Amino acid sequence: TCPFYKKIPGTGFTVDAFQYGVVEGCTAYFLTHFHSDHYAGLSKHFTFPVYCSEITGNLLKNKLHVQEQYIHPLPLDTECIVNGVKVVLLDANHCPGAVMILFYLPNGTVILHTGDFRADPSMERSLLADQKVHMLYLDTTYCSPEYTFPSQQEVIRFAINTAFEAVTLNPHALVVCGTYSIGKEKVFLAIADVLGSKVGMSQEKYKTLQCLNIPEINSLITTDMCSSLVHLLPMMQINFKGLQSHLKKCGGKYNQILAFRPTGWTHSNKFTRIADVIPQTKGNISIYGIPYSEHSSYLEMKRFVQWLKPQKIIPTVNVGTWKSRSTMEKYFREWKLEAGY
Ligand code: NI
């Protein structure tokens, strides 16, 4: 039975609610982005309208084999009507095709659902600026003071320099990046660009990337593992055993591997600065752990909410326990006091 926090009151709409069968009274199902927990239960047999970004539509079509008649791509930053209600999709700065959704309700109420997002100052100069928000449905993945991380920009800079260096010392070294769904593509496309290479990967993942409206993508990727000095592999395979195994499967063309794991947060954000970072090494194989987050840090979240001044906040992550719910309440109260709103 679909939870309240996936329902937009006053409408027949839900958000990211596909794993409940047919929801009683839902005329339109919104999907914020193409990640598995959020699209869970979508398939070729789904028969009701799905509202989403272009990129999210490409992916529902080509990967999930959803029938073209039930996919309703909407453009970003544009006032659109759906079943009598004015909506806007905004870029969520999360993964390719991820959106936030503004609902302007018949009764003059306005509702922002963030889906998954990583808050950024640029958001303050969008359609969100122009009016008051009554309810906020907030991605609270990192809602606790200990979650600090560096900027996406700082992290990609580190990984570029580290890769360039290792391959200039040894031009038969290979670079491997871990992946398991969309998002974090900027890590590996940036590395391949500096190095003058295409990015080699499997057929399934090559497909995924063709859906994402990247300019000139065909010139940047390949399934030729032998004509490629950057390769993608499942995140699980990013350990000493996996990397060795894969090194034997290229045809003696590389004699070393430098590999990257874009993790979210782990306990060494609380001490190690990015410039200090050093890899674990074993023979001719090296693994750097980099904190590339696609969600708001605590400070990012706090600043965003304080700007927005919503009347009510509804969390959409870490909601299952009383501990978590109560802890988040505490922080939202602190933010409100500190501001005055
Ligand atoms: Ni996500």
Query: Environment class of residue 284 by beta-carbon count within 10 Å: exposed (0-12), middle (13-18) or buried (19+)?
Result: middle
Query: How far, in Å, from the CA of 318 to the mean position of ligand 1?
Result: 14
Question: Structure tokens of 179?
Answer: 């992946």
The answer for residues whose C-beta is within 8 angstroms of residue 312's C-beta and 6 or more apart is 134, 135, 136
**Domain range 1-147+296-341, CATH class:** alpha beta
Alpha helix stretches (DSSP H) within the chain: 36-39, 54-62, 152-169, 185-194, 203-210, 240-248, 298-308, 322-339
Please give the structure tokens belonging to residue 250: 């290229």
3-state helix, strand, coil in the chain (%, to 5): 35, 25, 45
Strands across the sheet with 110-113, in order?
Answer: 80-82, 85-91, 99-104, 110-113, 135-138, 312-315
Cβ–Cβ under 8 Å, residues 181 and 301: no
186: helix, strand or coil: helix
Rounded to the nearest whole angstrom, what is the distance from the C-alpha of residue 101 to the centroid of ligand 1?
Answer: 15
Q: What angle do CA 290, 306, 151 make, to 5 degrees?
A: 15
Give the whole-angstrom CA distance, residue 80 versus residue 84: 10
Q: Rounded to the nearest whole angstrom, what is the distance from the C-alpha of residue 231 to the centroid of ligand 1? A: 23
Strands of the sheet containing 173-179, edge to edge, are: 221-222, 199-200, 230-234, 173-179, 256-263, 285-291, 280-281
Between the CA of 116 and the centroid of ligand 1 the distance, in Å, is 5
Residue 307 sits at φ, ψ, to 5 deg, of -70, -45
Structure tokens given for 167: 């391959």
What distance in angstroms lies between residue 68's CA and the mean position of ligand 1's atoms?
A: 24
Q: How far is the CA of 50 from the centre of ligand 1 (A)?
A: 18
> Cα(253) to centroid of ligand 1, in Å?
36
Nearest 5°: phi and psi at 128? Answer: -60, -35
Distance of CA 234 from the midpoint of ligand 1 (Å): 17
The data reach a resolution, in angstroms, of 2.0
CA distance 177 to 235: 8
Give the integer Cα–Cα distance in Å for 80 and 126.
16
Tokens for 237, please give them: 């395979």
* H helix count then E strand count, the chain: 8, 18
Same CATH fold assignment for domains 1-147+296-341 and 148-295: no
Residue at 229: amino acid letter? L
CA distance 186 to 35: 17
Q: What six digits make up the tokens of 210?
A: 């063709």
Which residues crowd ion ligand 1, with CB under 5 Å? 35, 116
Q: What is the number of other CB atoms lying within 10 angstroms of the CB of residue 287? A: 19
DSSP 8-state assignment for residue 130: G
> Can you give the residue ranges of every domain in the chain?
1-147+296-341, 148-295
Quote the ligand 1 centre to 69 CA distance (angstroms): 25
Alpha carbons 258 and 162: distance in angstroms, whole number: 9
**Alpha carbon of 340 to ligand 1 centroid (Å):** 32
For ligand 1, the distance from its centroid to the CA atom of residue 214, given in whole angstroms, is: 19
CA of 64 to the centre of ligand 1 (A): 17
184 alpha carbon – ligand 1 mean position (Å): 11
CATH of the domain spanning 148-295: 3.40.50.12650
Task: Report the separation in Å between the CA atom of 293 and the middle of ligand 1, taken as the mean of its atom positions.
Answer: 11
Report the alpha-carbon distance of residue 289 to residue 278 in Å, rounded.
9
Distance from the alpha carbon of residue 326 to the mean position of ligand 1, in angstroms? 23
